[model samples]
Target chain A: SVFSERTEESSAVQYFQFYGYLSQQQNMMQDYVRTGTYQRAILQNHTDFKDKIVLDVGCGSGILSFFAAQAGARKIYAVEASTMAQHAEVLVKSNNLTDRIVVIPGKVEEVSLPEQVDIIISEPMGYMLFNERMLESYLHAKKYLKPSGNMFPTIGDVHLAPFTDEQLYMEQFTKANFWYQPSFHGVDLSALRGAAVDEYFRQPVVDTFDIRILMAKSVKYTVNFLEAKEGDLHRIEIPFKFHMLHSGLVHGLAFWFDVAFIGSIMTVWLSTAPTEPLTHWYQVRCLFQSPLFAKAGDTLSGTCLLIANKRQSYDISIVAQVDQTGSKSSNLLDLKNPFFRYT
Target chain B: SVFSERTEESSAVQYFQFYGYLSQQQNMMQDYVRTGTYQRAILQNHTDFKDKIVLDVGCGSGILSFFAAQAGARKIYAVEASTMAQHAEVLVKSNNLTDRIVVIPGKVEEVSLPEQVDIIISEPMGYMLFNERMLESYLHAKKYLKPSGNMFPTIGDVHLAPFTDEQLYMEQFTKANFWYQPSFHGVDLSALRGAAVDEYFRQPVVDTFDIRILMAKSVKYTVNFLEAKEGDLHRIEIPFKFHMLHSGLVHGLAFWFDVAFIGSIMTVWLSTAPTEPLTHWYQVRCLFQSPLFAKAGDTLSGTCLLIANKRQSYDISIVAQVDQTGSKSSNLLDLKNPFFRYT
Candidate 1:
């Protein structure tokens, strides 16, 4: 079950964990409510919800339930994990739709519905689309869903590309090696430099970047919420080959996600691609220990493994290699050569 | 005992807590190491460390051990809770001071020491000098000190003042009410405004502000490490009355702390007063649910209660009152007043 609402007695570890899930950003929320995708999927995309029973998983604030009610849904069950559940109930009452919309203050997996839902609506994508770990929540609740049940975001695809961004590379370098500069008031403290390099990789970076930097892109993997198994969500692999256009240093891999609703009436899509104006999720930058130089003739190829760690978080490791020659191009950069494993 | 190092098997809760302690600040570390109270304390303190034993609680990076070693300490025990302890050992060995400084990778409270030390050094103060729970760490470890042993930072004081920063206040208001702005392409979302207000206080803000906006300042309380008990680090009461200097709106309470060494050789001190240049640990701005207007003749009085939650984190509540006219003047903003209790 999602943890009880945090009390005055809540521990520091609990608060820390809670902060990570607190806000998904109003930028994303605004778009989710007003513009397209899930909004339409619940309102206009489906066979009119005029009499349909619906379930809103991770139904924060009950807005989605309101959307369903606005679409004339007969009954709606909304589940939320955080303390937002209380406010969500208040919202349900304020809208005077409490009679039809039920707000469940717990994980969808733990809550039982009076009737199986015809549609499951959830907006669970996080940065890189995997950080929320909501995939399992959605999968678990699917049992209570009708066999013919349809998910609002039926499809989610993970994409990756190689990019050149000097500004970002410089910042990563600073974070990883700022302590290496010797003679801090005549004291040598360079030993922590090695540890700094490792520390920099402790968490992936989320940044807004220029799309023009990408040499090429590839769809590393995709998940169909309607069909993806709980097991399928773990140990996902990402591999891509980039064909360089001009001479530039490849600093990191830029990753984002796209979700879609292949609905009965209207199909809507939302993408966090760098090519689009910035969304709250933006792009996840998987920075390298050091930038890899690629000439016009060089190509960058690599394979990455994204394993869902013990706590529904991710542990990512990539082995990147660039085809180049001369002093900068040693066999050491070839991840396939077994001599270089930055992870 | 301190946690074992993080690995793939670590939980998300652990990871989030780890992130909070991972980095203090490169900027502050540079200043503290190069030129500061800490540096001068070791370089010029009266009684030379010739044959004295010392303990560095939360001894990150082993830099303090090195400082003691340079001061000719007979033996130095350094304790660090994070994996930084490993790096500290490497740093200790690289500097060729391994014989003098020993790095122990564990919490000071749980780790056993050979003997009570002549001096105990630590940099435990977090934002507003309490968020990190280092107060309890220091208080716990104080039991191992000799009766005559000295605490480098012997004094810790918490001060507060009401201030108005339009820019910062507007941002906080936006964060708390952005969702309330209705008619986004003609859709109303004023419903979620209640939840947003709750979120603005979810995590304390660490920001730098102009001190000139402060109406008045008061010393709420101070703790002396030499005589303080571990239990003393828990629940704290802060009651203060402010007489407005110039009529200005009271947006929130600006809180910060000052620490003094008060040593035999050198008395060194540092403060996070907004009037001073900013450090890595900036002043903590506790935003009120609503802004209060105060006139030149008005007195703003409030009482706050800080409870050390189960996790070493704090739960703070304030009951603010202003001598003013209009509907806003009545016990409306007092968190303790049933009419205004939102917690």
Candidate 2:
């Protein structure tokens, strides 16, 4: 009975999961394709694809296959899991590359290829570097590619900086407070205003912010596909420290990633740093319930540990603190446990 | 082995659920308190709370209890389930209302009230009116209130309108496609794109939209807390027909809700419609995979079915169709089964 109840209750997890369904955001796909960096990055190594077999994983709309075809690839296998595969097939035919591009609608791990390819290309970065967790599949595809095959955007790096966003805190507060509109007529509705602040703490949101909000940037971790192994992807931890340049209230940490596309002669870096033009990825922020006061020279340090669960989402725990100098105040915030819950 | 694996996996569901933690969003509380509508509405029914015993369920920060106290409630029970309960206790003491207001840190159903109260106040509406399923608790509290005691926000209405938001679609598309950035060095990443369209068809989103985009508005269902039975909320089906006044693309339906505080003397209404000043509730949108072309005189009709999943959220199924003049098509759309994945 316990097992049965657990199974039934587990389904509710979907309501809390933001990464389960990809089709909810059409703007994301359009922006990714329209972003000129990926196209230019792929084209910069065009000669490498000439007459070479290529594998396109998660080929929504088949744009990457068309890119490879444009780059003079001999043949391409476009694998897709969602119904978007049908559109990809149509796109391939419409673009007159039907004979060269094969669209397979299934998971990369489940699908079979007639022969090993010379190249594997995928776009699998998620919020804070591992939210969507497509990298595991990308690494799995490595087996189907030739021993000498190459991966695009050869390097992925995660970065974080601590800062304050009073406006963001207020916005989140307002959302929770909406429930405070509990009184209508004469019924006490305090019972109904559940799930306010706790939900926000559990889910990290993606948004664009001013670069100046960041005190300093520290690279958390970098993974090179060429040398990264399957074991390297699990149980990863990144420790970082931030030295505040100006005395201010530190709310929480902001996270983003930079992907490097290494070409034959030049390396093109695609970063979602607040200083750069905002991409659809924006930044994943974990805001705290309270703000900590810090001086310009005070050093704040912490560590973030990310582990991918079975659902391909990340479970992250963060711990940060202020430098102990005049007073050894251990006023720190834990992503899992905090000093106080803001009412 | 399977049970253990499943138990381990279920823990990650917390990451996806935003409604569970209320303290995570300080802004939501601020917005709710600042709205002033609750204050006006509650204060409007001041006679009900004046020198009368009151029960404040889920009273984060004890604002409602404070309001009740201000209205001359002899004694108030401020109940909260989060860590915010500590703050509520402090706030009550700070305001010197500690003797009158008792802060109870727990669920209303589990907490014991010393005596039957004359009034109960809570703020518990969630996205689309049922996201957090607090109404169940509100209804549970109904049994404990006196036969003549009243509940605040006496009525809740779910509203739906079919409309187009090309720009919103573009933005969401960009978000989903951000995952498509799958390219590695010289490889083709067309394989990793998943959940492009159908996922949007399944889950609803909370956002704000321009009023002009709505073709027409229809009140799907209204639950009057005074007369609403516990069984009424479990499985709800509201059929609606919308007559479009202006010709435009029909992307999907937008859902919002309004709560009415039907006081004995005056009624106050709080709506999260696009025309109103946006609240955190915003509008719950379900964008289609393809834009439905329609003429100004076209009628868009559909039924929205909301079932309370055991997990405390809702599973919604929407079915809408346009007038069949030229197309003569059932090809219009099915809420359950559709050809085009809107991703």
Candidate 3:
């Protein structure tokens, strides 16, 4: 049935193909905060894996499977939807773990395992925790786990904080203002100025910035992987109210996330916050067209919505209001259009 | 006729639109080597421009026109195909030179100048000296020049030199070889290895490198704008024979260029060669899939051909043979396929 219906042109196949590339795999592996956390979580809690059955969903390169085997798992089912499965099999053989780890080359929905596993592991998090929608696949794979089975990362929290960085704001403003000039060089670009401003401000910028840029306290939206159904991921709306730490211009909002691997022995948290060591999943920043000034005690209230799209991306929308006298500017944010985070 | 047949979607229109952006204009203006050379070429030859009529083809931002006006040109026609012409008019007025410099908004083929001019000045060189094929337009603008009129940057030369940079080669190799691993991580990527190598090597890399990497004396292909016909640029074949100065692995060929403004009082040369100060043009590098080793005194002979493509880019092909005793290796360079340079 898979061969009869599936085509290489399918978006699912393209998604899997992207992961099949070793360069991309290397990028994930090089993120020590990400890879090291999983390593420590598995190796430190060896007793939990001792003589137990484990399942690795979307096991790219079968890394988690090898970790499980090293942690004394009796048998590990490593399922991968990409051609990476072929490489994983070869690696498992090279590492002399073929007997303990079985590489299953198929999707979680299509693959049939001999039995339910006692533990499950997967690195399905994308940018801001919900990008690429890989968590849905992880949730589907949960059916293969035993009733009392544990997941590697039990909880994930997405955090949002208002920030101010004059330099970054000016850089974006300068780029967009290139079109704002009525007579720049020898051309009149006044017509394209609005489009240029929207083009620059509407897209979320993925980058790492200094923690000092954060202007206020942060808020978070948590996801309990064990209880979160696929439907719950359709639309995630996070409400935040932050009191300004100091007087500054509010340039935009920054987003980061942290996932906690609640192991039986110890819990390990992997964070992509600005305060934490840099990872491949650098914080996402959404800049405003115009900066708003706020006093030390002023409050910034906002609702950040991440609505899942059919293309395995998220349409992020934020509605922020600053409760500061004289800062009640009508055009605070572009409320009509949503910023897109394409996979 | 222009309104009935021409649309904004046309390639020519898009080309002009790209030049209309102030950021791009700034990039060109910020290139001190490029901008300074033109400034000196004009200001240093005030005697030739004294009360003379001049035509500035593709007068981006009217910078050249202003230079000519300052050089004592009585009347100057600043022709621009892009909307930048509108900005140029505004700039001329802002500089109080509107009476002397008149901005004409249209292509060289369509724009009607009031009278033949004593000089024609334009900055039409793209990557590799002829990438955007703007030289043809520059040549077409010659119709408005007086019989004894001079063209600024009268002669342009494209230079080629063999280079060896082990680090750069290894970087490209390591990136391409990610797919070469039979078992990378846990997947077999042996199938896509060939494509990866081709994908990396088939596109000419546009970058600047240290002059020390050059292994031999360079060869040049000169273009005399004063006499060169448009048909002469349709296909350019540069035959080069370089005597190796040192023992090194020849990784690829490097290309750079220099343009000379043969002025009345003095000659000004703008070079983008590696030994010279950096410019926006930088240098073009065409790398081989496999590097060939050559000892000192070894002769590396090749024919570098640049054929005009339909897309306004060029298909560059090089066939080289290293006359080293033990370096007569087959498959040293991928001569079968031409390197593409997209504008």
List per-prediction Cα lDDT, in the order shown: 0.67, 0.67, 0.77
Better of 2 and 3 by TM-score: 3
| Residue B230, model 1: Cα distance from true site in angstroms | 1.5
Q: State residue B200's C-alpha deviation in candidate 2, in Å.
A: 8.1
Q: Report the error of model 3 at residue B319, Å.
A: 0.9
Error of 2 at B331 (Å): 12
Q: Per-residue lDDT tens digits of candidate 3, residues A1-343?
A: 3222322223454467578765567668657788888888888888779999998989886778877887999999999988878877877776777789999999877889999998889998987788877787787778888887888888999889989988877776687676566543333445555555655576677788878889987888999988887768888888888899988889888889999888888888989988888888888887766677888999987677877765466777777778656453212232212233323
Chain A TM-score by candidate, in order: 0.83, 0.82, 0.89
Residue B184, candidate 2: alpha-carbon lDDT: 33
Share of reference contacts found in each model:
0.29, 0.25, 0.00
Instruction: Report the lDDT tens digits of candidate 1 across residue range B156-181.
Output: 98888878877766766676676686
lDDT of 1 by residue, A1-343 (tens): 4322211212323433353232543545566423455566666764747788888887766667777787888898998766767767876776677788899876675677888888887777766787656777777778778988888788888888777778766764576576686665444667777566555554466667667878665545788898987667677777666777778787777788888877788777878887776666667777676678888767787777777644445667776788554312111111111111121
What global local distance difference test value does model 1 have? 0.67
CAPRI band for model 2: incorrect
Q: If both were scored by lDDT, which would come out higher, candidate 2 or candidate 3?
A: 3
DockQ of 1: 0.32
DockQ of all predictions against the true structure, Cα-based: 0.32, 0.17, 0.06
Compare the candidates by DockQ and give the number of the best one. 1
Considering just the first chain, candidate 2 attains a TM-score of 0.82
Give all TM-scores, in the order shown: 0.85, 0.61, 0.64
The better-scoring model by DockQ among 1 and 2 is 1
